[PDB]
Amino acid sequence: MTIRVAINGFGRIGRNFLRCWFGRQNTDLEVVAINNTSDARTAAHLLEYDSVLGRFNADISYDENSITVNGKTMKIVCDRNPLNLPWKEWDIDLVIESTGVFVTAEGASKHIQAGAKKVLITAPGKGEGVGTYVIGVNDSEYRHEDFAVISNASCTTNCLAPVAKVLHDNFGIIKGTMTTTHSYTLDQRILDASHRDLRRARAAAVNIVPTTTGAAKAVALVIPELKGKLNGIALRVPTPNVSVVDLVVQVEKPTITEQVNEVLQKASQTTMKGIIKYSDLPLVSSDFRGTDESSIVDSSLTLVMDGDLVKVIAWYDNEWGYSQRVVDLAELAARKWA
Amino acid sequence: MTIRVAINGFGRIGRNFLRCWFGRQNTDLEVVAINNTSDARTAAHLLEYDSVLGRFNADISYDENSITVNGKTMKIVCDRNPLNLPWKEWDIDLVIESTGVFVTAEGASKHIQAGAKKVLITAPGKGEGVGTYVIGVNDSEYRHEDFAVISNASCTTNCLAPVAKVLHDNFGIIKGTMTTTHSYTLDQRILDASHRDLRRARAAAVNIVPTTTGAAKAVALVIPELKGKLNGIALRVPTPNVSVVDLVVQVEKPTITEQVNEVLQKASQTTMKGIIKYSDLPLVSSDFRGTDESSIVDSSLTLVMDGDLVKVIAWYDNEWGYSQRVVDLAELAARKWA
Amino acid sequence: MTIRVAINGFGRIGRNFLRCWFGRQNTDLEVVAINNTSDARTAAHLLEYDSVLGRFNADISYDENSITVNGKTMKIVCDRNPLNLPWKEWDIDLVIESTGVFVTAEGASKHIQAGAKKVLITAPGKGEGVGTYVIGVNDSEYRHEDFAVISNASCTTNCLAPVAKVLHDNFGIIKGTMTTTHSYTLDQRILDASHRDLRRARAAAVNIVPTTTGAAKAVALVIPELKGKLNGIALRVPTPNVSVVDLVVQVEKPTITEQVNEVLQKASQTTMKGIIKYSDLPLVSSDFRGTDESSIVDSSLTLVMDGDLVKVIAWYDNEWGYSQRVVDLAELAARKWA
Amino acid sequence: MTIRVAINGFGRIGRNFLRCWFGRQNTDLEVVAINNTSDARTAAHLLEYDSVLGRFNADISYDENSITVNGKTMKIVCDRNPLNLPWKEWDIDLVIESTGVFVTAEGASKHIQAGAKKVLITAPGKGEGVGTYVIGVNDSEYRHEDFAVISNASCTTNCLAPVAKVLHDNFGIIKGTMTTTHSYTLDQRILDASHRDLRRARAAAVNIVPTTTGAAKAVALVIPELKGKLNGIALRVPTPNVSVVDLVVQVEKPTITEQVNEVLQKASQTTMKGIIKYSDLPLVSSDFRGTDESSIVDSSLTLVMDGDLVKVIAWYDNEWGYSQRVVDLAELAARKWA
Numbered sequence A, B, C, D: 001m002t003i004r005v006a007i008n009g010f011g012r013i014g015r016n017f018l019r020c021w022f023g024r025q026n027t028d029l030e031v032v033a034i035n036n037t038s039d040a041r042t043a044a045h046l047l048e049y050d051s052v053l054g055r056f057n058a059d060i061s062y063d064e065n066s067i068t069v070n071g072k073t074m075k076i077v078c079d080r081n082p083l084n085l086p087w088k089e090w091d092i093d094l095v096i097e098s099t100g101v102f103v104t105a106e107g108a109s110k111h112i113q114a115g116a117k118k119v120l121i122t123a124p125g126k127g128e129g130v131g132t133y134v135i136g137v138n139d140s141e142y143r144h145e146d147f148a149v150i151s152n153a154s155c156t157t158n159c160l161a162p163v164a165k166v167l168h169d170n171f172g173i174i175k176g177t178m179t180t181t182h183s184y185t186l187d188q189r190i191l192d193a194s195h196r197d198l199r200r201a202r203a204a205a206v207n208i209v210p211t212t213t214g215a216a217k218a219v220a221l222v223i224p225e226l227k228g229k230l231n232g233i234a235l236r237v238p239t240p241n242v243s244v245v246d247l248v249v250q251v252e253k254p255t256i257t258e259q260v261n262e263v264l265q266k267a268s269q270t271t272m273k274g275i276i277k278y279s280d281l282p283l284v285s286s287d288f289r290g291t292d293e294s295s296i297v298d299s300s301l302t303l304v305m306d307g308d309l310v311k312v313i314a315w316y317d318n319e320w321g322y323s324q325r326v327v328d329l330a331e332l333a334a335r336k337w338a
């Protein structure tokens, strides 16, 4: 039956996930609690009024201890430390980890000590003992008992992995390389300020800033055949949302642009319905705000050099599209709860 | 004497201050130490490379706990707790407090408890007990013994006060209002994220964002005759540096556009040289990047409606100009030192 | 009965007007033709996909000579010269002038020679013989026979005029002054390039650029009692949409903040329903995208100095809100057609 | 000889060219006239004040039909039709064509018909019959008599060619792909507005915008061995200056990251001094503002996947660096002049 759910850290991903879930047709989820480093006041307001999502059209209320949306009432808490959270008493089955701060098996597992059964990191996990899934790529390989702490990977990996999969299943990937042109995030600085990354230290809205990305390697986690076959880098540009992957692969079967486009389109219609969108129209970044899929292939941008060096460009709503997938993963965890 | 100076917090203001100070002709200041949350490497890199100021043209080098600029070595410490600092042992006369977090008389006097004799908050003072000075406005009221904790006020006030002084001295301000169209700062949030000001909580580079400002009440600290006579609001817009003040005052002696521009000009050549720049060219914000002055009167924007309702638009480089003034205020304390 | 309508110049205003009209509950208008300096291809695509409005959710088709939206078929033409347009044969009653280029009584009147009965400039008119209306302020004063060429003023004047009216009717305006902080427009340059205005010549997205505005004077056109009582200036900032008016007036009846807020709210509920919105929530510029009203008063920003110097700040969607008014004016022209 | 030069079109490239030329050590060029759509006033103002370059530090003065810089007077004309120009009577050897509209052999030869002996398009050549040179790449193939109309190619090609040359000379390029993340330019539209490229039709400072580029085919004009071996796409992002090229080539001799960085470095010290800058610091885009070089290799971004799939990231100041190269190309034509 249904599983009870709480959110941890009500930021971009956290509020996106909610609105994604509130838009859902059907569900096996019951959101019931939210924990964030701010009062309920600042919660129910960043929810309704979003610089990027536009205004959430829904009945929204709040008091000191709760917030409420379209009938449904949640519960608000405020513990910087998950070990202190009322998950046992509140019979919390799954916690969505969206603080960005508890991404190790241990930290994410503090929610387990506190009474929760399973935790879903909305971000790559670090260290050992987290199970990583990307919907459309990996999720047939899901067993409730494998991991109490799971990861939905990164927004970038979710864009990249489904395209890698299709390209691989159809032409065989030998090796390749990838660049992501990414809208800045909160991990960057609006002005030159201290950061562990001497580049992310620098004013985000007036720079192209190069940075590292684990995403090309991460595909290995969900497509182990591509282990050591992909590298990459990211470039932060001053957009606030939507991002793009530029993937170049040496492929085993010689092909043409029309054909790799054909197979990507096929997938968008079939094995990848809902995950890959196929765009043949001459569009730009803002046109994909609020798109549900995880990779949006720009077919007119696909390229093939001498039969076997292919390039495809895929867009993604790095916040919203990713949040539809974390929803999906949660629904899957629900349906498969052993 | 020649006084020994420590910089607490090596951010925008902190680094501008060092850059301004190295480019000075003569000085009664010796900068001996710097405390900042990062390491000496991160500090020297952020010092040499600046997105707004461009490259620092100097000989810069660093080891594990010092940076050296043009022969002058300065010790680096990393201590979030000002009570810990070895100011007594390093014979520190003046601490420049530019962390933005010790802005009360008590917070900032942590530096005095640790051995310093005077501290200069590079921001307005919070609460009672700090002494505030705006070079060109009330610096003649500076007395060594008055306060252990002193303030250079805000960039906005430093832009407002000089213009207000000249306007009031020549026509008599009765009451007035001001709006500041301000580049975003590090106190503003990168993307939609929590903040005590729900408006400051929103993505700074995609929003015009209204916030309160103390700047207009503050001018009374330095021009007491204006007490109770000015209020203002601020609107944060997506540029990374240089702001503008839009001042509307009702005035005692009726006047004309030609005449107020005339007095503002006269001032810029005499009583306010170096403090008020007088610009009669059709310029825009970026042209004032690097301007040493505090206020830059845009002369062709001056309006006088029906004799006694005057509007003056004045730009300011909100980091660089302001930082030249903190230098000035530090030099001043040095010369009046007892 | 209904009047037949054509649009001239399918840019921001032109496409906004259409979508506004397509969202309308009821109507006395029948759009039937569109004339723009580009094929129908580029027309039906800039319509559906908008960087600012988001995607137009509606059934949209096009061939070489037409475009079609939700059943309704229009007709596409392409004459840089209105004298060549098929208005006579197409029995065109009203033309919406949105090219920005035919804003004199003569030029706008070329549409008359070509067979149209009335023309509505979506912009201030210049020279003599255009009748200017701002809904909520002036429109009771509308007579079909006064002008064959009418003007809906500017987006800025529409924000300013209703607030001036209410403030005047309640407290008596003596004189005042206004600044608009405006999202850049197509009349600006993305980079430093030649322009009749030496300031609008300069890179719009990385400058605060001062420019002139006729808006404060224009209020005189629709509130002749305020003739010579208002001046102002504009400041272009790098946002793409939403703008703000900052209005400061010396008022005759001494009042308080609560009260001027009270009267503005009253108006938003009554004589100004649909034109003035009253916002008491702590919001930012992006939150008013797609708002229908012409002035959005930010009550928490209202100020009163010594009883009789009042400041109110009003937001506006400079494209969308203005386009709801041009629709309104057109509906009025229809209903009053003598 | 020492040659007489006219500048047709005083825009970004036009003005950079003059600024670059005045800051040159020695010159075989004499600039005698300038043709631009505006007046002499607008030209001198745009020359002194530049949003990207900041203030031109020179003695600048102007009358109705001349500007004077550091003693050197240059005549101003305003003639949209190159056939009209008095190049024969002013004994004009070399016309710098930087209007962006006479880019075919025939369009540009209008200047030859009007009396000039050679024209240099500051952009790629459209169609057959123009000669193309990239300083540092094939300038040794420059022969006075080969073409009346010559080209400096695009900023992107000027960044790509040098890197391509060194990569190919040392490892042997087989085939490859490139993407250019480019600051927006004046060919890009301010807000959503009509254009032949529906993607270039969209607001440049709020969109990542994909457009085609000839840059990768073009490198073959200057490195013929690369004919048919490179393709590319461009992505326009919201910065006003400095771009970056992301180059992926499959290579004949297997190699390692250390070694390609080694050869790129060696080059930057020897065979490509002044053309390729070698940056091993963790920098960002703004740090390359004002860089004289053509390509700036970001050494820590270099990737080599599995021996023969190399990626190099290289920045360029797309206006300033490129304009130093048009100077170079003009000096070159001057020295080889017959």
Ligand SMILES: NC(=O)c1ccc[n+]([C@@H]2O[C@H](COP(=O)([O-])OP(=O)(O)OC[C@H]3O[C@@H](n4cnc5c(N)ncnc54)[C@H](O)[C@@H]3O)[C@@H](O)[C@H]2O)c1
Pocket: A008, A009, A010, A011, A012, A013, A014, A035, A036, A037, A038, A079, A080, A081, A098, A099, A100, A101, A122, A123, A124, A153, A154, A155, A156, A185, A186, A318, A319, A322, B193, B194
């Ligand atoms: N932004 C994207 O596009 C994107 C895409 C994929 C994954 N992610 C990942 O999602 C995670 C969240 O990133 P974000 O972009 O939403 O930034 P965010 O600022 O929105 O972080 C979300 C929230 O966590 C809250 N929080 C912090 N510490 C907390 C604590 N101790 N207890 C409870 N709440 C706490 C913060 O106050 C914030 O509201 C990150 O790990 C990021 O890597 C982000």
Ligand SMILES: NC(=O)c1ccc[n+]([C@@H]2O[C@H](COP(=O)([O-])OP(=O)(O)OC[C@H]3O[C@@H](n4cnc5c(N)ncnc54)[C@H](O)[C@@H]3O)[C@@H](O)[C@H]2O)c1
Pocket: A192, A193, A194, B008, B009, B010, B011, B012, B013, B014, B035, B036, B037, B038, B079, B080, B081, B098, B099, B100, B101, B122, B123, B124, B153, B154, B155, B156, B185, B186, B187, B318, B319, B322
């Ligand atoms: N930016 C402007 O235009 C402007 C103008 C005038 C005044 N100010 C004032 O300058 C002050 C600094 O603002 P900023 O713009 O320079 O932001 P900032 O970049 O300087 O951030 C402040 C610095 O202090 C450091 N720091 C934080 N906590 C510390 C601690 N406990 N101990 C030691 N160091 C610590 C931070 O790591 C950073 O280096 C603020 O109070 C602001 O109001 C700013």
Ligand SMILES: NC(=O)c1ccc[n+]([C@@H]2O[C@H](COP(=O)([O-])OP(=O)(O)OC[C@H]3O[C@@H](n4cnc5c(N)ncnc54)[C@H](O)[C@@H]3O)[C@@H](O)[C@H]2O)c1
Pocket: C008, C009, C010, C011, C012, C013, C014, C035, C036, C037, C038, C079, C080, C081, C098, C099, C100, C101, C122, C123, C124, C153, C154, C155, C156, C185, C186, C318, C319, C322, D193, D194
């Ligand atoms: N942008 C605003 O916020 C705003 C607000 C109020 C009023 N206005 C006014 O609206 C008018 C249009 O401005 P805009 O912002 O929509 O710019 P715009 O670029 O969208 O101009 C609209 C269209 O007119 C077309 N056009 C040009 N010449 C033509 C011709 N000879 N025949 C037919 N079509 C032609 C252009 O191709 C463009 O598509 C201007 O006069 C402006 O002052 C604009």
Ligand SMILES: NC(=O)c1ccc[n+]([C@@H]2O[C@H](COP(=O)([O-])OP(=O)(O)OC[C@H]3O[C@@H](n4cnc5c(N)ncnc54)[C@H](O)[C@@H]3O)[C@@H](O)[C@H]2O)c1
Pocket: C192, C193, C194, D008, D009, D010, D011, D012, D013, D014, D035, D036, D037, D038, D079, D080, D081, D098, D099, D100, D101, D122, D123, D124, D153, D154, D155, D156, D185, D186, D187, D318, D319, D322
């Ligand atoms: N911006 C870059 O990074 C870059 C780099 C390399 C090459 N280019 C090339 O430089 C050329 C100019 O582009 P830009 O960026 O300098 O835009 P721009 O600012 O220079 O606009 C071009 C100039 O030419 C003038 N002009 C237009 N028509 C004219 C005519 N008929 N006669 C005389 N003058 C006329 C315009 O008024 C303006 O002064 C383009 O062809 C572009 O492809 C640009």
